[PDB]
Enzyme design. Structure first.
Site, PDB file in Angstrom:
ATOM      1  N   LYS A 165     109.792 -20.286 106.098  1.00 51.21           N
ATOM      2  CA  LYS A 165     111.158 -20.448 106.563  1.00 51.21           C
ATOM      3  C   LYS A 165     112.074 -19.575 105.698  1.00 51.21           C
ATOM      4  O   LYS A 165     111.925 -19.516 104.465  1.00 51.21           O
ATOM      5  CB  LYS A 165     111.614 -21.914 106.523  1.00 51.21           C
ATOM      6  CG  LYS A 165     110.856 -22.944 107.429  1.00 51.21           C
ATOM      7  CD  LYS A 165     110.475 -22.394 108.792  1.00 51.21           C
ATOM      8  CE  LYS A 165     109.469 -23.258 109.494  1.00 51.21           C
ATOM      9  NZ  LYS A 165     108.897 -22.560 110.715  1.00 51.21           N
ATOM     10  N   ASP A 198     110.180 -17.189 109.684  1.00 52.31           N
ATOM     11  CA  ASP A 198     110.969 -17.981 110.650  1.00 52.31           C
ATOM     12  C   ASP A 198     112.385 -18.205 110.153  1.00 52.31           C
ATOM     13  O   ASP A 198     112.574 -18.928 109.177  1.00 52.31           O
ATOM     14  CB  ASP A 198     110.275 -19.340 110.897  1.00 52.31           C
ATOM     15  CG  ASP A 198     110.916 -20.142 112.065  1.00 52.31           C
ATOM     16  OD1 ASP A 198     111.968 -19.710 112.639  1.00 52.31           O
ATOM     17  OD2 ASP A 198     110.400 -21.251 112.384  1.00 52.31           O
ATOM     18  N   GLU A 224     110.397 -14.273 113.199  1.00 52.40           N
ATOM     19  CA  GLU A 224     110.644 -15.314 114.220  1.00 52.40           C
ATOM     20  C   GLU A 224     112.094 -15.845 114.235  1.00 52.40           C
ATOM     21  O   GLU A 224     112.691 -16.123 113.158  1.00 52.40           O
ATOM     22  CB  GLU A 224     109.645 -16.476 114.071  1.00 52.40           C
ATOM     23  CG  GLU A 224     109.991 -17.710 114.952  1.00 52.40           C
ATOM     24  CD  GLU A 224     108.918 -18.823 114.966  1.00 52.40           C
ATOM     25  OE1 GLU A 224     108.290 -19.067 113.915  1.00 52.40           O
ATOM     26  OE2 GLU A 224     108.710 -19.476 116.042  1.00 52.40           O
ATOM     27  N   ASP A 247     111.814 -18.427 119.579  1.00 53.04           N
ATOM     28  CA  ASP A 247     111.407 -19.825 119.529  1.00 53.04           C
ATOM     29  C   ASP A 247     112.492 -20.703 120.184  1.00 53.04           C
ATOM     30  O   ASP A 247     112.406 -20.980 121.382  1.00 53.04           O
ATOM     31  CB  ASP A 247     111.108 -20.220 118.086  1.00 53.04           C
ATOM     32  CG  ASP A 247     110.635 -21.671 117.980  1.00 53.04           C
ATOM     33  OD1 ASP A 247     109.850 -22.094 118.867  1.00 53.04           O
ATOM     34  OD2 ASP A 247     111.061 -22.371 117.017  1.00 53.04           O
ATOM     35  N   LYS A 271     106.560 -24.682 121.877  1.00 53.66           N
ATOM     36  CA  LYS A 271     106.452 -26.006 121.276  1.00 53.66           C
ATOM     37  C   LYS A 271     106.397 -26.992 122.400  1.00 53.66           C
ATOM     38  O   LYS A 271     107.263 -26.983 123.245  1.00 53.66           O
ATOM     39  CB  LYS A 271     107.619 -26.302 120.310  1.00 53.66           C
ATOM     40  CG  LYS A 271     107.575 -25.378 119.042  1.00 53.66           C
ATOM     41  CD  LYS A 271     108.588 -25.800 118.020  1.00 53.66           C
ATOM     42  CE  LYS A 271     108.299 -25.231 116.651  1.00 53.66           C
ATOM     43  NZ  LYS A 271     109.339 -24.223 116.272  1.00 53.66           N
TER      44      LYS A 271
END
Lengths: 372, 372, 372, 371
Positions: A165, A198, A224, A247, A271
């Site tokens: 992250k 991400d 991402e 995403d 997801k």
């Protein structure tokens, strides 16, 4: 074959490891889960999990999930749970959006359809692809050194992908901290690994471009969710050489169409509860595969019930396009069900038992908050 | 002048050396060739070869070539073999596509026309350009050092071009392996060489962008056939600084126009049997040369017969734009015809005899499998 | 469950009504059909048909279809016929393209799965959407007055859509004739009808723009397959206000993605054997539905075996995007199978029997020409 | 086979009929022609013509053609005239552009090649396509009522295709005059007819859009050469639903690629001495046919010698892309050679080897230069 009863359960899933941090000062300490059972007149029970990544990841929250089920659940009572497109249409016709609520219901319906055919779900969704699915870690934001350590445990535990992250405020160090984070998380890299940075829709284009300039040349990394909006993401795309995975911005089938039309990205993070269940995961897989888009198969977060759906879908996905499945067991401390799917021989393999292949610890759920 | 008789032969051509490897786990041990003779009422004979690179390279296979010839061969009987455009149109109104089939007939008609005019094919296709034509090798997939050694052997044989097959799966080492194969194959480079990294339509755009990231700066290399589709190649093109060469995706003259309209590439891999013979090779040459696209003049694979068509076409191509002819003799072990075209003095010069310049070994071809 | 035996049949299907004409001087009198039966170790039989529209509609012909089956049919023996995606994958790594050959096998494998499950194919493919599906006639090329009567004759029988074949040479009257055939075919129009003007890839852009200028204002018609190539279709699109439907140009899932990327059309003619079976029809439907593209559900041409496939797919297609199903029963005279699907209440409804719902006439297909 | 001698001739070709007006006040009373013969060591003779349409149609004039031949003709002495691409290379290496001058040499070389093969040129250039080739009727710049009546005349004689010249200044009537001319010339139209409005690169975009607005809906018409530059033409193309044909802007092979890249037109006017002879006409044909562009096969102007080249080329062109050949014999009074190719709005290429010309060498005067 008919749905006769739907039960809604609620539980808390404590974070495994420290506070999970995303860009923009978002912090998560535990996760509020909605678990749904569905029963047929013939006596089959299907299970579905929907757990928003708290209330700040996308436009969903557990309390909203439950309020939507109040509309969705009675809408689909007395339907044939095997007619997945027509169940989907009934939900759409009942309530626009709210895919988090659709997901728990859709998964349980698929879980039934599979048990009825005496097949594991991977054999209902195209057919088992040989060998185990590689699994990806979820590395919360921290200092470069602390992040690089969390990468190191996961590697030892046998993870092959890492999702690190990023998205430091200027106050916290900015693009220079993010660049240090990425170089540190790749420092101990070994062959066959795959890295995803991400940002969780958290960077300005200005910050992304400054970060990209600070990164050393010659890194193998996929970016991402770098920005909060489509228009920002399109600006960055014109000026970024790295592959890009979307995403939060890809929720519906028509979002994926918009991304194709604008040539917005090279990959998608699917997801289960974000897309709305197995049904849309299959449609979106088919669109992404036709487009040559790689796909990481994931969920917001969840238990073993969520993991089961992830693994079955991942297991019927062409290995050429798949970029790991999320092992949500690494993410919370909870124990809601049994599934035999350990980490061996490079990844995880979906079980061979019909349906999702779960044994649900029904006492861990608590008494239904609601029944239909 | 009139076509009186058409014989269809079938023969196997063994790979020169070890297994030949392409991206996607494709492996080759030998190739199913289809050789055609066409005879005139004046006792002229012309020869033409079409050998699909098995069944998995483009939408073509040997059994497919023979079944198409069942339609095409009867349809051209009685035509003047010298009216190339009218024969081409007769083939088109008989059967759409199947250019591998047209190729064998088309080449044999040009061989006849050249013989009747009393000129080598190169002097019928615009005129010999002075000096030998540089030749290019085919370096099948293997480890970097194994690939590197194959390049050394070809360099020693006097090869100036090298086509290096890339396209590793994630399990095999992915972009990093492909990056190493490239750097390895380029490691012993001497002045005047030219390299193509050919992925045979087998990369995702994600893999390609990762690979380009991993490559060291300052390489002189051309990327060929990176992606499996038009939309994927368009996306990569937007984000790639290297020259791109298209191959599999350019089959028709209209495909080349689409490549121009979208500015999709800087070069084209023209393969005699993929384009469909001498006639379309000429049209496509004209289109590519007007667009200042470089051209590598090749075939899928073949004997001395295919090599003869290749060499005469290259011999009449401007040197400014030509990037090698494929020496098909380096790829296969078979001797189906004799041809006076040694590698020496920088490359291979086309024979001065009329037609293709071949002395065909009828014994090597077996009894015709079909006659019209 | 395992595939044990595959039998390939060849028959001939005579045209119903007079000689069928397409743009560019193409004429069809009968069709060469390939019918496949597949048998499992459990004694279930599945059926599928593939009949190219002669040899000149796309790059496909019955002889090539049969030749391709020599590769495909042994490739899939022993596989579980319910695993459509892994069967597909097996077919693609055996042989590129040849979707006509995949179709016959693919449909037979779905037939089996629907039987194995005890479900009509439409409940295996999303679920029956309520009501009969409207059917589309196929108005072959003739004079404006002759065309306008064929339309009338199909209307009497309860056909709601009409595909009118246009595309005149300059010698026959060019654009102006086409503009006449369209006005004529639309002159007896009743409420609830739908018209497509189908040029089968046969117009130049110049001819199509002249034709558009010539059409009277205020017409409700969709233009189908106006031009030969991608680049021409794009020029037309830039200057054409009519909805446009693409047919020959869309065979693969990636073709459909390219059309989305280029915003090239508002609709798609999906034909079971052009797309390559139930499996790619379902993939392409998911893509088209996500893009909001209308879909006419058709086939090249066929007997009742082809028709059962069409009708079952159309019956599970969202009514909002469907633009009729083709009734092949009006295109040919053959009676290769029995199916309870009469034109009434506004169109045809899929039968309720497990699988395709066919009673095949096993001696009407004659002794198989090959068995595996 | 070797080129041993080249003779360059100059003859004047008086206009046949009324003085020919183009847009921008352009006017012509005779054309200055350059004719070339080429001899081989085997005694074969080849003929080619290049005659620019005066001095203002494109960047070419007869005195420039002849100055250019002074460099080009000695350059190709000694070459095999069958080697068309290598001759073309030698010419480019010698002198950039001047395709008018290349044309005469390139056509005579092909004439030889065809003779040496015993085939009519049409069968050297892909093969004869069946039936005669439609020929284009030309409707000169003049009044509307006048124009329509000349179309009625040409129609009576069997011509189905008409090229109608437009491009009135504001003084003379502007876009309104041009719209009237067009509507007039179409007014009594019959089945099977094809019309081209030719502005010869002379409209502004503003003029052209006002004209398009003033035209009635429902017309079957192709617009040719509307604008003087590439960027103007691109502007108009963005706002024009009419099929568009480019002429003066398409000279080289690379011009045609730029047109594809920009999606600039739906057709091309190919003229033998603008493109530069048979060799580039053939490259340009292959590019245009691949792009699905329709083609009118013409020349700037010329005698029977120019006509023979047009006709053999048109005769090997796919019929669904061809939009007429030009009969240059209707344009000039010159009688420089005999060819058996009479007109029904149509003509067929002769079946004799080479161009099929019987050239009257004496009619050409004494060569102005020999090499």
């Amino acid at each position: 074959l008919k749905i006769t009863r739907i039960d809604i359960h609620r539980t808390d899933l404590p974070v495994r490891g420290g506070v999970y941090r995303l860009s923009g000062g978002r912090e998560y300490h535990s996760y509020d889960a909605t678990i749904v059972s569905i029963e047929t007149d013939t006596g089959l029970t299907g299970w579905g999990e929907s757990t928003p990544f708290g209330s700040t990841y996308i436009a969903a929250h557990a309390g909203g999930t439950r309020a939507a089920l109040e509309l969705l659940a009675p809408a689909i009572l007395g339907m044939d749970p095997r007619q997945h497109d027509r169940i989907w249409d009934r939900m759409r016709d009942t309530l626009k959006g709210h895919r988090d609520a659709r997901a728990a219901l859709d998964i349980a319906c698929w879980d039934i359809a599979a048990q009825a055919a005496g097949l594991p779900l991977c054999d209902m969704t195209g057919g088992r692809v040989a060998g185990p699915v590689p699994v990806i870690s979820s590395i919360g934001g921290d200092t470069p050194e602390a992040m690089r350590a969390k990468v190191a445990r996961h590697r030892a535990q046998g993870f092959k992908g890492h999702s690190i992250k990023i998205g430091a405020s200027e106050a916290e160090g900015g693009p220079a901290l993010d660049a240090e984070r990425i170089t540190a998380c790749l420092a101990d890299r070994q062959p066959g690994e795959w890295y995803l940075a991400d940002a969780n829709n958290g960077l300005t284009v200005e910050h992304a471009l400054r970060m990209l300039s600070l990164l050393p040349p010659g890194l193998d990394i996929v970016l991402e969710a770098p920005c909060a909006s489509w228009a920002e993401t399109k600006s960055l795309r014109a000026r970024c050489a790295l592959p890009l995975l979307l995403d939060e911005l890809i929720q519906t089938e028509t979002d994926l169409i918009a991304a194709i039309r604008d040539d917005l990205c090279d990959g998608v993070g699917l997801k289960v509860s974000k897309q709305g269940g197995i049904t849309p995961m299959l449609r979106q897989r088919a669109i992404a595969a036709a487009a040559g888009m790689v796909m990481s198969v994931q969920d917001t977060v969840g238990s073993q019930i969520s993991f089961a759906a992830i693994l079955h879908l991942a297991q019927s996905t062409p290995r050429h396009l798949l970029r790991c499945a999320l092992d949500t067991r690494a993410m919370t401390t909870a124990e809601l069900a049994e599934i035999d799917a350990p980490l061996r021989d490079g990844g995880a393999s979906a079980p061979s038992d019909p349906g999702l292949g779960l044994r649900v610890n029904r006492d861990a759920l608590g008494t239904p908050v609601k029944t239909f």
